A paper describes a structure:
Based on the successful strategy of our previous work, the structure of HAd11K/ rDSG2 was solved by cryoEM. During the image analysis, two main populations of particles consisting of the HAd11K in complex with either one or two rDSG2 modules were identified and two 3D reconstructions were obtained at 3.5 and 3.2 Å resolution for HAd11K in complex with one or two rDSG2, respectively. The binding of rDSG2 to HAd11K is very similar in both populations meaning that the binding of a second rDSG2 is possible without interfering with the first rDSG2. Several putative hydrogen bonds are predicted in this region which likely contributes to the binding. Several hydrogen bonds and salt bridges are also predicted in this area. As reported for the other two serotypes, −3 and −7, the structure shows that EC2 and EC3 ectodomains bind at the top of the trimeric knob and that D265 mediates central contacts with [name] (19, 21). We, therefore, produced a D265A mutant of HAd11K and subjected to BLI experiments, clearly indicated that D265 is, indeed, a key residue for stabilizing the complex with [name].
In this study, we elucidate the molecular basis for [name]-11 recognition of [name] by resolving the structure of extracellular domains of [name] in complex with the [name]-11 fiber knob protein. The structure shows that [name] and [name] engage different [name]-11 residues and interfaces without overlapping.
Numbering used by the authors:
A (entry chain D): 108 to 135, 146 to 193, 204 to 334
B (entry chain C), C (entry chain A), D (entry chain B): 129 to 325
The structure:
Amino acid sequence: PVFTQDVFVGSVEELSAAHTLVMKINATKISYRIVSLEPAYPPVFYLNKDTGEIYTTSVTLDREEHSSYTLTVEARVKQAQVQIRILDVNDNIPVVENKVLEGMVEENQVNVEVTRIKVFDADEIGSDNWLANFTFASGNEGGYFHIETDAQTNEGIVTLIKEVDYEEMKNLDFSVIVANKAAFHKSIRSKYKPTPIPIKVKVKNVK
Amino acid sequence: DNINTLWTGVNPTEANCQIMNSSESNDCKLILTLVKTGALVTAFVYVIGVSNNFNMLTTHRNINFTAELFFDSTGNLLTRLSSLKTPLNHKSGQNMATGAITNAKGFMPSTTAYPFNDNSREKENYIYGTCYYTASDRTAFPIDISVMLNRRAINDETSYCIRITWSWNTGDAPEVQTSATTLVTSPFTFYYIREDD
Amino acid sequence: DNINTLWTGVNPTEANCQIMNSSESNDCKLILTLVKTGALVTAFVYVIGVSNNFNMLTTHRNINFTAELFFDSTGNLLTRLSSLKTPLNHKSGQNMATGAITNAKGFMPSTTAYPFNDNSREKENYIYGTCYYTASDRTAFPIDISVMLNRRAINDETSYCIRITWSWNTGDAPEVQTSATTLVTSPFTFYYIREDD
Amino acid sequence: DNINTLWTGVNPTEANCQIMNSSESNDCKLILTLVKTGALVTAFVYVIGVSNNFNMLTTHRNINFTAELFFDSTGNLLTRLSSLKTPLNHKSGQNMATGAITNAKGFMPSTTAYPFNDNSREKENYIYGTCYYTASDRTAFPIDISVMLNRRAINDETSYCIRITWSWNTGDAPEVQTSATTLVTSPFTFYYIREDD
């Protein structure tokens, strides 16, 4: 048989169900077989020797373990190469890496950063599954602090846009919840427990 | 054989129960099937939302709602006091069999195993379980069910009580205002020793 | 149709079992019901503490207590070894139908489904589930239940074995000594494939 | 009385279902029983591993596999399409009663209860549960189960459908490459509403 392309490319989603048609090897009875698999482990792909359609097996794929798979295949000699990229699904919750969060605000200052909150997500870097969406659980009902997501480091930057009175002894201590920008996958949804991370605000007594 | 079933039927055309007190009419369909199995009754219960105020419950992170069924000494459903406003009946095809019932007493919780007005045996009047709400994005949020059998009678005419309370307290709301379609709870099956015929 | 049920009866007057090995007399009430459902048996089992030693268990963090029932070639309970010291009988209202039993074997667990002394099939002899203890503060505390069917027979006359092990391991006991009143578990329902009549 | 059962038998001699499409032949035993209980059908299902490819699944952190049963308008299993390749039949001792089956339509999910191709009632076609796997260290390992009823028909001969999807996702595989012996699941019992005979 003669293959129609030396390099085939397909994609399948992370946590794909069993017998999900990944892609199709084209050549032109034709009997196929898998010559080799990198990283060869675990056996997550199945080649139907009669039709040449590559499916997923009962071994659920895992992207954070293996980025992409390289198959060397034969048809009945010539060997063809196939690259299968696993598409990420938001199946890992972010965990706040920084623990002791005690911001130091300066009295009567506007448009100044209050603090930084480091975050970790095992999801694909740069995708919506990886960026962190911050919501103010409590302590910012008065509209003083604003939080943004530095996508470069996936960090929650807390800044201030309102002048504060130190002598007022305003209890600016607050607490936040962390969640990825894209909705969580069905695997961990209903397992998501939004435990709030607090942060303390310290006010400089400007003289 | 059909005499051994006591159910509301399968998907009654119109809403037949009022769970939320705020509702001025029936706000959902309560599908309940009680089957005699030797010395026990197999109860099979779930709810299908109808009214918008009921279906909107899918958008709240913490919800709870209760269905109370009260039966007189002969087992007939007290519609005026209960949450199910359509009397139970036997099986005819996939519907209720229109006609009188005389053996309803056999389906009710036994007044011995589940006694009225006794604190010492109180703990024996509670069953617990869990169902699932399937989301529009194909999740499965667990709903905690607490069932109480005849352990308290509010009125004199009440002779058997079955209070089923669904609740959840989750992280993310199952649905959003636009994606919310209906509140259908996965079937819940429980067992209770039945009263003597 | 009372012949299709084999139970200890609704709450007996006195303690009817010896679960904890430390107790010298009947220490609690074991309520067990078995109902034939076609080719299966539905078991419906729970406990009601009586002795102070048994009731005090709720004040402990790490408990595990087992009720063991054994049956001969005729399905009759071997009281001398089984924890449940009172035999099982058919239904008669809320009590045992005092009389001879012939089809007890029909309720017993199938040896073909659940073999004796065969390592290769060991995993077929285990069932698992959860029951709930209702706390005095109106909260449900989980309690694991592990059921072993047959597998191991101690002696020659043992032909069927049902071991029901209740357990719980937490960091905070469900109750305290001043609030612990009685150890009562919500009914646990399980199923098994039954021996031929 | 044996007509109220339709099951695969107890521990069939050879594998009776090809659960993995990658397997060249039958790879696991699907022990399934359906019992009529008035208006409901109780299904009782579990899986026994035979082939090495299926037995090795115990060693992987994430696994999912589905057993699909398609039944035609007269309740007979379409073997050429389903995972389980042996037609069901009634109970006869611990075997299948070789003979013609006409009442199988009563064991099938009701079309009015679990519709085909109706989005508004889609959520009604979902049931959930938890099986357990007995690790070699005598510890229970949960396995989530999703049971879909009807909801789609592959080809024109499919009148009823039951899809049982087992799956687990955890950080440590229940076994290791040396300890794995076989993959046997603890029984799962679920209920559903049945169609008219």
